[PDB]
Amino acid sequence: IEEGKLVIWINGDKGYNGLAEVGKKFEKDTGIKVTVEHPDKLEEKFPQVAATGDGPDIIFWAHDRFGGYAQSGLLAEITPAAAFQDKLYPFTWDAVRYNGKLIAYPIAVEALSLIYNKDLLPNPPKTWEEIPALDKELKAKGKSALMFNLQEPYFTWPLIAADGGYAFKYAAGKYDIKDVGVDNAGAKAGLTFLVDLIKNKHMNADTDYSIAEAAFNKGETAMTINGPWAWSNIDTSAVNYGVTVLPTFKGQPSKPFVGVLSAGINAASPNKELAKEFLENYLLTDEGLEAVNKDKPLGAVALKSYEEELAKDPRIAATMENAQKGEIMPNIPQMSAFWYAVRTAVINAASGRQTVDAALAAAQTNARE
Amino acid sequence: IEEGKLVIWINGDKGYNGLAEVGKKFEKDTGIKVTVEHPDKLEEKFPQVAATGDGPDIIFWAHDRFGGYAQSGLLAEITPAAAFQDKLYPFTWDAVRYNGKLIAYPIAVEALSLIYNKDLLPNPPKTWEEIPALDKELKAKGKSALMFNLQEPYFTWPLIAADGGYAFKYAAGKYDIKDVGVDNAGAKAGLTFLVDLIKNKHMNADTDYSIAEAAFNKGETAMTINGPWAWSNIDTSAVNYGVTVLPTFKGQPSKPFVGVLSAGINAASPNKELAKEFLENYLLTDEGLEAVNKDKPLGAVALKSYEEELAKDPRIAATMENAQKGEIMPNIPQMSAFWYAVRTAVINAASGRQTVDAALAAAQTNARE
Ligand SMILES: OC[C@H]1O[C@H](O[C@H]2[C@H](O)[C@@H](O)[C@@H](O)O[C@@H]2CO)[C@H](O)[C@@H](O)[C@@H]1O
Ligand SMILES: OC[C@H]1O[C@H](O[C@H]2[C@H](O)[C@@H](O)[C@@H](O)O[C@@H]2CO)[C@H](O)[C@@H](O)[C@@H]1O
Numbered sequence: 001i002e003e004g005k006l007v008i009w010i011n012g013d014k015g016y017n018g019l020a021e022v023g024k025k026f027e028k029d030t031g032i033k034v035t036v037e038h039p040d041k042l043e044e045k046f047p048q049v050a051a052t053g054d055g056p057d058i059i060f061w062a063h064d065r066f067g068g069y070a071q072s073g074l075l076a077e078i079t080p081a082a083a084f085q086d087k088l089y090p091f092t093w094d095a096v097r098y099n100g101k102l103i104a105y106p107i108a109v110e111a112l113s114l115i116y117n118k119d120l121l122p123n124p125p126k127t128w129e130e131i132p133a134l135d136k137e138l139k140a141k142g143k144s145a146l147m148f149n150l151q152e153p154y155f156t157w158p159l160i161a162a163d164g165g166y167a168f169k170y171a172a173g174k175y176d177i178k179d180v181g182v183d184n185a186g187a188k189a190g191l192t193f194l195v196d197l198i199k200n201k202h203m204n205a206d207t208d209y210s211i212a213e214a215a216f217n218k219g220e221t222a223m224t225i226n227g228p229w230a231w232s233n234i235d236t237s238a239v240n241y242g243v244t245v246l247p248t249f250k251g252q253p254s255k256p257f258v259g260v261l262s263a264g265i266n267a268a269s270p271n272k273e274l275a276k277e278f279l280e281n282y283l284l285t286d287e288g289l290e291a292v293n294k295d296k297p298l299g300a301v302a303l304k305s306y307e308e309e310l311a312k313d314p315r316i317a318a319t320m321e322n323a324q325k326g327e328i329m330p331n332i333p334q335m336s337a338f339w340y341a342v343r344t345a346v347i348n349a350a351s352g353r354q355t356v357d358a359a360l361a362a363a364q365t366n367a368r369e
Numbered sequence: 370i371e372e373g374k375l376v377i378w379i380n381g382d383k384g385y386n387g388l389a390e391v392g393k394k395f396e397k398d399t400g401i402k403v404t405v406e407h408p409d410k411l412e413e414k415f416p417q418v419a420a421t422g423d424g425p426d427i428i429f430w431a432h433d434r435f436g437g438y439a440q441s442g443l444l445a446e447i448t449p450a451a452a453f454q455d456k457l458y459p460f461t462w463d464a465v466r467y468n469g470k471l472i473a474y475p476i477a478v479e480a481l482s483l484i485y486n487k488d489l490l491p492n493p494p495k496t497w498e499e500i501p502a503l504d505k506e507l508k509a510k511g512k513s514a515l516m517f518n519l520q521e522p523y524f525t526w527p528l529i530a531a532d533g534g535y536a537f538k539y540a541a542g543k544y545d546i547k548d549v550g551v552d553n554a555g556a557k558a559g560l561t562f563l564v565d566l567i568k569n570k571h572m573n574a575d576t577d578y579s580i581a582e583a584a585f586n587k588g589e590t591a592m593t594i595n596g597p598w599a600w601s602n603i604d605t606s607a608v609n610y611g612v613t614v615l616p617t618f619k620g621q622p623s624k625p626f627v628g629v630l631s632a633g634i635n636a637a638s639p640n641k642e643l644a645k646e647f648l649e650n651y652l653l654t655d656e657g658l659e660a661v662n663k664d665k666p667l668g669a670v671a672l673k674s675y676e677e678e679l680a681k682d683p684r685i686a687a688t689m690e691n692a693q694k695g696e697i698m699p700n701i702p703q704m705s706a707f708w709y710a711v712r713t714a715v716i717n718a719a720s721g722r723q724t725v726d727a728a729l730a731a732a733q734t735n736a737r738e
Contacts, residue, residue, distance in 0.1 A: 003639035006647060013598045014630065015664025022657045026647050034647065053637035057644050062628030064708075067700035075633040076641055084649055091697070092671035095629040098700055104633035105648050108658075108667035110596050111692035112625040113612045113684070115603065121591040124611070128562060128618045135571040138591055144571070147584045148594035150719060151577040153711040155594055156563055158615055158623035158695065160711070164555025167626075167707045167736070168699055169548035179538030186533025193497060194528055202504040202513070208520040215516045222490035222507055225517035225524055227479045229382050234484070242493070243482045246527055249497040255530035256481040257523060259431030260464035261383070262473040264438060265445040268422035270372040272445055274401055275426050278375060279474050280453055282395045283388075289477075291391050295384025298477035302461035315482070323480035326527065328460070330537060331436035331467055338536045339433075342522040342529070350519055367536070 001054060005033050009046065010060035012038040019060075050074040063095040063104060070103040077101045112158055128159060177334050182342060183357075183364035190249060192356045195349050205350040216241075228299035228319060243315035246322055256326035261298060334367075341366035370423060374402050378415065379429035381407040419443035432464040432473065439472040446470045481527055497528060546703045551711060552726075552733035559618060561725045564718050574719040585610075597668035597688055612684035615691055625695035630667060703736075710735035 001007065008023070010016045016038050023034030037056070039045055043065050049055035051074065059069075069075045080102070085093060092106030116124040120143065125131055135145035149155040157165075181187060197203045207215075216224035217237035224230075225246070234241050246254030263283070265275045282288050286306045292298055293310070299319050301307045310316050329335065345363035348354040354362070370376070377392070379385050385407050392403030406425070408414055412434050418424035420443065428438075438444045449471070454462060461475030485493040489512060494503055504514035518524040526534070550556065566572045573580075585593035586606035593599075594615070603610050615623035632652070634644045651657050655675045661667060662679070668688050670676045679685050698704065714732035717723040723731070 001635065001638055001640070004643075006640055006643055013665065015598070015601075015661040015667070018661035018664030019652070021660050022651050023647075026651050030643075030646075032643055050635055050637060055635055055637070057635055057638040057640045058632050058648065059635065060630060060632050062698065063631045063700050064626075064628060064698035064704045066631060066633050068702040068705055069633060071702045074636055076636045076638065078634060078645070080649060084653075087653070087673055088671045089673060089676075092629050095697055095700060096631050096633075104631035105653060106671035107630040107632060107652070108597075108671055109669040109689075109692055110598075110628045110630060111668065111688050111695055112594055112596055112615065112623075113687050113691055114592060114615045115585065115595055115599065115610055115612050116592045117585065117588055117590075118609045118611050120588060124592060124613055125616050126614075127620075128616045128623075131566065131616070132569060132571055134591065135566075135569075139570075144584075144590045146566075146592040146594075147572060147576050147581040147590040148592075149576070149578040149581050150572070150574060150715070153708060153715050154626065156560070156715050157711065158594070158625040159563055159618055160551075160556050160559035160715075161624040161626070161695075162555070162618035162621045163558045164550070164553060164621075165559055166550035166553075166696075168701070168703065169545045169550065170699075171543040171545050173542035174540045176538045176540055181533070181535035181538065182529075184533060184535075186531075187529050189532045190529040190534055191525070194525060197500065197504075197515075200501060200504075202501055203515065203519070205519060207516050207518065209518040212516045212518050215513070216484065216486070219486055219489060221486075221513045221516040222503070223483060223485040223493055223515045225481050225515075225527070226484055227481055228477075229384070229479070230484070232384075240487050242485050242487050244485060244493055245495075246481065246483050246531075247494050247497045247500070249528055249531040251496075252531050252533075254497075254527035255534075256527040257433075257530070259433060259479045260461050261429065261476040261479060262432045262435060262465050263476055264428045264430075264435055264443075264473040265447060266370065266419055266424055266426055266428065267443050267445045268419060268424070269370055269426040269445065271370070271375055271401075271426045274373075274375055274399075276447070276449075277399070278392075278395050278401075278403065279427065280449060282391055282398075283476070284453075284456070284474060288391045292384045292387040295387030295390075296382070298384070299480065300478040302457040302475040302477060304456055304458060307458070318482045319480045320478075322482050323478060326480060326530070327535075328464055329431065329433035330539070331432045331464060332537070333437040333440040334537065335433045336437055339522055342526065346519065346522050346525045346529075350525075 001057060005035065006058065007056040008034065008036045008058045008060065009042045009056040010036060010038055011042065014060065047072060047074060060107070062110065063106070066096060066104050067098045070098040070101075075103045077103060078105060080105070112155065128162075175330055175332050177332065178368060180338070180364050180367045182338075182345065182367055183360040187360055188356055191346065191349055191360060193249065194346075195352075195356055198350055205352075228297035228315070231315060232296045243318045245318060246325070253325040254322070256322050258323045258326050258328045260302070260328070337369065338367045370426060375404070375427065376425040377403065377405045377427045377429065378411045378425040379405060379407055380411060381409075383429065416441060416443060429476070431479065432475065435465060435473050436467045439467040439470075444472045446472060447474060449474070481524065497531075544699050544701050544703075546701070547737060549707070549733055549736045551707075551714065551736055552729040556729055557725055560715065560718055560729060562618065563715075564721075564725055567719055568721075574721075597666035597684070600684060601665045612687045614687060614694075622694040623691070625691055627692045627695050627697045629671065629697070706738065707736045 096104040341363040345359040349359040710732040714728040718728040
């Protein structure tokens with residue numbers, strides 16, 4: 001492959017002439033020649049040549065082939081700025097993400113359509129089952145009902161998949177409830193640091209929600225850790241406060257468990273419709289959420305409309321920054337057992353009833369049950 | 370629980386008076402009284418009472434508890450219309466999805482942040498490690514560096530998780546390359562229907578891309594199945610055509626494999642920067658994509674700006690309708706083996722060299738090797 005040139009492969013059925021024009025402008029601007037080719041079976045050829053360090057600088061194809069190319073080490077990992085990545089839909093980036101790395105730029109989403117001649121057939125059939133009859137009608141006019149590519153499985157697949165054909169089954173992401181990471185070295189280091197703060201009287205083991213809030217809001221302490229709901233009381237307070245990213249530990253960002261405030265309907269409630277009505281039509285509106293939010297801030301609401309408006313708040317922006325650095329909380333049943341286990345571990349380690357090692361090791365065992 | 374009333378539980382730290390006001394409006398509109406309560410330990414109480422068929426009509430909590438509630442059969446499965454579901458961010462719906470069912474309405478996302486008093490501390494510490502020193506300084510002023518709730522593990526967890534603490538390890542959703550669904554009854558039914566169309570001379574097994582396109586564009590056939598790239602040639606043709614949803618089979622929507630045309634960069638290319646420049650700055654622009662699109666339509670482009678403009682096209686709308694009913698293609702290496710397997714099966718079944726059963730059974734084995 002020549003340096004200071006760009007060779008592009010794209011399939012013949014796509015607008016390679018249009019791409020070539022983009023190449024002409026690139027050449028005009030940069031003096032770098034851009035050669036667009038559409039070889040036969042380019043998608044089969046590319047691996048073969050690319051293995052040998054030869055072939056095009058850029059290959060165009062549906063993403064489905066690229067995992068294979070990546071796995072063979074034929075694709076360079078792409079590194080677009082976050083700014084650029086935001087310009088494309090995330091699901092298209094998912095298509096080109098292989099083993100965590102981006103391996104291609106998404107370009108366009110292609111799906112088969114039923115294309116019909118309005119002059120022969122003003123209302124196309126809504127079922128496949130109608131087509132034989134339609135064909136009978138049309139054959140009497142020396143026409144046929146339907147013809148499409150039967151050589152490529154891509155074209156016949158929609159009908160094959162229709163009643164439950166699939167390629168490979170997608171396994172849901174499970175949670176390993178035997179993989180507990182409370183007693184690993186990361187947890188130990190973190191908690192040890194916390195215990196050390198207490199030991200050096202920088203913090204008091206006795207501190208609870210009330211004490212912490214009152215101390216911060218009385219301007220007795222420089223900083224607190226708390227969620228959106230807390231802001232109301234700080235606004236009440238004469239304290240001029242900022243809401244920011246959590247501090248790093250060992251150069252890693254603090255990783256808060258993210259909650260989704262959520263409204264469940266009692267299975268035993270005879271008022272399910274009413275519950276549905278209230279939540280859907282009253283609470284989950286700009287007006288409803290604003291009412292709650294005005295009392296105590298919710299944070300980043302789940303309703304897109306109001307959230308967009310709320311996101312202007314730098315406190316909410318900080319909320320979301322910390323959210324992204326942290327993890328959404330599992331909703332599995334074992335979560336309560338996990339919480340209880342860590343609660344006890346922290347308390348006992350902080351109070352000095354137990355060492356960090358022993359406390360966490362105990363939590364490990366408790367959380368696993 | 371009493372019918373024709375609504376009892377709501379929400380934690381005391383959230384804005385329950387504001388919620389109550391939403392309840393007052395609901396009552397005004399519907400005459401249904403809404404009682405908002407904030408019991409102590411409501412999250413522990415709810416399961417207890419709910420088991421007995423009693424408790425609030427609606428329970429509010431972070432999603433983390435709801436899996437547990439669901440598992441105990443305390444929550445009614447919620448059924449919002451797709452229209453409503455689109456109004457909330459999907460990741461919040463994920464939080465409330467348990468064993469495939471929605472079990473709660475997501476309300477708002479909460480994350481702990483560092484809150485600091487700008488008047489005491491204009492620049493908050495970017496690391497935990499600075500805090501001891503900061504505290505020393507502040508104690509000499511009769512203040513402390515940090516105080517927060519140590520009694521709830523939620524507050525200490527960010528530091529514990531920071532350096533690699535985790536609850537339970539989350540296993541990413543795999544693709545099972547041993548679970549192949551080409552020879553299931555849905556695939557058999559679909560392909561059988563196709564073979565039957567050929568057997569009844571409604572279609573010719575020999576029909577390929579060229580033949581199909583030429584036939585439709587010459588107004589010889591009522592319908593073809595094809596992608597956006599095909600439209601150019603039909604516009605050229607005097608044919609008056611529409612682009613629509615694929616027909617249903619056995620009252621199921623056709624499920625086309627969705628491809629994302631994507632551009633990968635050759636790992637062996639010395640021109641990687643140039644490739645990056647061209648793709649990012651020339652192709653993936655309104656202008657670049659318009660150039661390609663004008664030659665042969667791309668469909669729904671991945672670039673948000675241009676896509677929004679393109680979406681006005683009813684052909685693209687139909688494209689997206691079909692896309693949503695179908696599935697994005699896996700990008701895994703085994704995809705090529707899958708395609709090859711189906712290609713052969715279809716050809717052999719259509720040509721009549723093999724029966725649908727034998728062809729698909731063979732494809733099954735070939736796809737899983
Ligand atoms: O067939 C033309 C059309 O389909 C393509 O799908 C291919 C797939 O990408 C290949 O790897 C192949 O082995 O099987 C499929 C067709 O059976 C492309 O996805 C698409 O862009 C192209 O226009
Ligand atoms: O702790 C109060 C504050 O955090 C909560 O997180 C809880 C969790 O929800 C509970 O079930 C518990 O066992 O563990 C965590 C605290 O350890 C809520 O998620 C949050 O909204 C609440 O305001």
